[PDB]
Amino acid sequence: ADAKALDELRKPKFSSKYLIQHVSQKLIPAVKEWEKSYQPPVIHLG
């Protein structure tokens, strides 16, 4: 493990790719259930 492969060494370290993947995995099914549960409310004028 003292020598590493080039495909392991090519990747940049501190990118926000897994933050974006985490936000996407928390955002997409929630907005899917919002889309399937969408009902516009009845607004009273007055």
């Binding site: 003292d2 020598a3 590493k4 492969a5 080039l6 495909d7 392991e8 060494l9 090519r10 990747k11 940049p12 370290k13 501190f14 990118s15 926000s16 790719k17 897994y18 933050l19 974006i20 993947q21 985490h22 936000v23 996407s24 955002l27 997409i28 907005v31 899917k32 889309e35």
Partner: protein, 290 residues
């Protein structure tokens, strides 16, 4: 692993960990695993949000793989940088920047009957100088016709606004006749080739100017950061950077089980490996298994 939409966005990528995920997926398929059926659902709004986050997952590691041309002479490192950003946008599923911001102009003002609503709803994507000049032109035309200019395109008020807007666009440096004739097309392909060569001259000048402006902003920010850093004594610098590093490790170690924090600590370990591999042999550099 991947949710099978990620691997489809990572097929045309050139980034390292996305390519290893694609290669492990292909080895799993050659082992005899069935390919999951792609979803034939989701509303247009849900589909476009997924596309936005997947294109962000392609762009974000690929931006970190591009060297900024800081402190370089000549237009060719800036053209390399702009070409790498273009190829990265193509790998993430974007079209040409011209086409992709024309999409934003057509989307933000799809329902707009007057020119002022167009200039107020596309304000985030047009320069404030050009937006202010077009607003002065629109106020002058609305003063001369005593009516709001409409966005129909066949009224005479919009024709006067379009003539004065072409004037201010030529004055600001945009060859608006060339830009219009490229998107309009031509009957013969030779005149279309002449117009396309003039357009791509403008377009290369334009993205080279934007990339050079981004490089100049990063250069000025780095020079400012270094000047306020060099104003300090050494021990203040050491304790400030040690405190910031300790707080960032504490933020990454607070989250356990998250994929981003696991990858963060793995990358900290890989930076320590790089330092040890350079310390083993400084003249050869890091040990690459080959």
């Amino acid at each position: 692993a991947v949710s099978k939409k990620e691997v489809l966005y990572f097929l045309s990528s050139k980034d390292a960990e996305s390519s290893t995920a694609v290669k492990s997926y292909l080895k799993s398929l050659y082992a005899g695993a069935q390919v999951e059926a792609t979803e034939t659902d989701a509303s247009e709004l849900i589909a476009q949000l997924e596309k936005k986050y997947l294109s962000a997952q392609v762009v974000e590691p690929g931006v970190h793989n591009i060297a900024l041309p800081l402190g370089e002479s000549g237009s060719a490192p800036v053209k390399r940088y702009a070409a790498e950003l273009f190829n990265l946008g193509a790998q993430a599923g974007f079209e040409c920047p011209f086409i992709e911001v024309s999409k934003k102009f057509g989307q933000e003002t799809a329902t707009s009957e007057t020119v002022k609503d167009v200039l107020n709803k596309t304000k985030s994507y047009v320069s404030a100088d050009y937006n202010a000049a077009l607003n002065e032109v629109l106020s002058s035309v609305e003063a001369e016709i005593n009516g709001p200019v409409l966005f129909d395109g066949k009224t005479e008020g919009f024709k006067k606004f379009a003539a004065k807007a072409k004037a201010v666009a030529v004055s600001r440096g945009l060859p608006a006749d060339t830009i219009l004739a490229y998107c309009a097309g031509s009957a013969n392909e030779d005149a279309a080739d002449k117009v396309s060569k003039e357009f791509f001259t403008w377009f290369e000048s334009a993205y080279t100017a934007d990339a050079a402006a981004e490089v100049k902003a990063i250069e000025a920010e780095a020079a400012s950061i270094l000047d306020r850093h060099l104003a300090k004594p050494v021990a203040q610098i050491r304790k400030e950077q040690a405190s910031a590093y300790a707080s960032l490790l504490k933020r990454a170690e607070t989250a356990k089980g998250a994929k981003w924090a696991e990858k963060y600590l793995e990358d900290v370990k890989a930076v320590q490996w790089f330092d040890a591999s350079v310390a083993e042999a400084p003249a050869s550099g890091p040990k690459v298994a080959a």
